[PDB]
Amino acid sequence: QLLTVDAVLFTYHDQQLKVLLVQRSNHPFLGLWGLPGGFIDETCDESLEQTVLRKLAEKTAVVPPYIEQLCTVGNNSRDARGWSVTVCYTALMSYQACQIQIASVSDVKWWPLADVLQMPLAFDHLQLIEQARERLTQKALYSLVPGFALSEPFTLPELQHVHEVLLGKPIQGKSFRRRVEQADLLIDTGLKRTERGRPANLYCLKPDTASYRFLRNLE
Amino acid sequence: QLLTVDAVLFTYHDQQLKVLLVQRSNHPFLGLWGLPGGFIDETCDESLEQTVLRKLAEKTAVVPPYIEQLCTVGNNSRDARGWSVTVCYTALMSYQACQIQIASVSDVKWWPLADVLQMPLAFDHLQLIEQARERLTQKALYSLVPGFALSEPFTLPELQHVHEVLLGKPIQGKSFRRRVEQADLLIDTGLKRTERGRPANLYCLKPDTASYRFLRNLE
DNA sequence: GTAATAGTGTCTTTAAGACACTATTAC
DNA sequence: GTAATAGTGTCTTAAAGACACTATTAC
Ligand code: NA
């Protein structure tokens, strides 16, 4: 081993992306903010994914609905002690699902993505986060994967705004709706949610939203 | 460490993909065919990529023009001797650039992709290879990355046929030519290659072919 | 009624598919 | 001339952009 498994976990709340951060309880950089993650445990971990799920669960108490391997970083500069390797994942979950737990804890917090990009973070985690969010931004163009950051069920303009924040620009609502109906990835619950407008349909994500990719990108 | 760094290295020759295999010089499964790869050497390797390149160069004497990290596999099943982690890459290079040297050698061979899918390979390298070509097949739909498997310069129908083999079906020549023209990724050498037909333009790949993605997928 | 937010109709625009038509070589 | 392979012109199709329109709530 000597290897590490980290995760960049995103969610959406307050019309913004937040990212889960954990304050190191060990040297070096004890008390610096970093990504959740840690060493492999061969007694309970049977795959790398099992590890990153365990590290997340140990902080949020829930297994997130979406988890993709992002990349692995390894070199002799990211850590002053020498050669270090991290297998990094990207994940999405809903904010309510775990806000309650992380709040009664001080070494764990949802941070506003936008802020984070200004905080000094452990090792190369800032870069990893940027990489994660870039890849996420890509998925905004050709999947409905961002949906996994919402609570279920959700309205279509909720989903849309999440995409909009990721692309940093508005999206033709009509285009979005067309794509959604076509891709046949949402389950209409028949319920509605009203918030200062016409009541909007509430939908749940079909599982294969994770694997489904659009043939054309948005712009 | 204890980690390993492998590569699925493809090329194209005789209207088919071949993949570089290396016969294990060590136990276990000594003499079984597997991917080129190996341990990290902290004296001379400074990033993971430097490792994989060194492992490839040690067998081909050529640094491949395209290399992207595929994924990292780690669990307790793929190796009977317990927990095992491989960081695996996908690479492309041209066949002639390398054939000469590797024929001089016996524990190294270009294999026809189509065949490899039948012979037994070390550990989980079969799956890795399939992931590799699956993703390569994806790139055929929305990049010109397959080009890196050809020798420079090459004709557009040469490039096209490579895509066609990856997609396992024929492609509309006009569509391809439009896409290529629009993406402004080829350099016309003003040279021509005549082979049983009208002479065809010879082209070189602009470096940024590696990162360029089309807005719409082919079908 | 109005303000607000959800959702549609429909036209224009983009880029791919289909495929017949031309071009340039060896013979 | 024919056969072969490279490359075009152009109509049709699929799916996004733009944007005016209707719908359904709270007040
Ligand atoms: Na990866």
Side-chain angles (χ1 to χ4, degrees), chain B residues 156-157 174 177-178 195-201 216:
Chain B
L156 201 139
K174 183 61 184 205
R177 309 178 83 108
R178 269 184 311 216
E195 279 188 342
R196 275 203 322 286
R198 173 188 184 167
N201 295 31
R216 173 159 167 173

Side-chain angles (χ1 to χ4, degrees), chain A residues 69-72 135, chain B residues 69-72 135:
Chain A
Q69 204 177 241
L70 180 67
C71 69
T72 295
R135 165 101 123 259
Chain B
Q69 203 188 257
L70 177 61
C71 68
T72 292
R135 187 158 94 213

Side-chain angles (χ1 to χ4, degrees), chain A residues 156-157 174 177-178 195-201 216:
Chain A
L156 197 146
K174 175 63 170 196
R177 313 180 90 103
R178 273 191 303 217
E195 274 167 21
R196 308 188 319 273
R198 172 193 189 162
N201 291 29
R216 172 165 168 167

Side-chain angles (χ1 to χ4, degrees), chain A residues 71-139:
Chain A
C71 69
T72 295
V73 186
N75 55 51
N76 57 1
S77 63
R78 64 194 299 264
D79 192 317
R81 300 172 274 164
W83 248 90
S84 80
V85 185
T86 281
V87 179
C88 192
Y89 288 77
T90 301
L92 305 181
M93 50 169 299
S94 103
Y95 178 83
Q96 268 318 319
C98 104
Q99 171 50 223
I100 163 151
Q101 280 100 345
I102 61 86
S104 77
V105 193
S106 55
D107 69 336
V108 179
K109 163 179 191 175
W110 282 117
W111 289 89
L113 200 39
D115 284 345
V116 181
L117 310 167
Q118 252 67 41
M119 315 195 47
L121 306 165
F123 308 113
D124 51 8
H125 296 196
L126 175 61
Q127 312 186 198
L128 291 166
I129 299 179
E130 294 168 329
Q131 200 167 336
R133 118 135 248 180
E134 267 147 26
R135 165 101 123 259
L136 192 48
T137 294
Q138 282 299 118
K139 319 219 87 76

Side-chain angles (χ1 to χ4, degrees), chain B residues 127-142:
Chain B
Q127 301 175 216
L128 290 174
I129 284 167
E130 289 146 310
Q131 288 192 227
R133 104 143 260 175
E134 257 136 36
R135 187 158 94 213
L136 196 48
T137 293
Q138 287 302 291
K139 324 206 81 61
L141 300 170
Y142 62 72

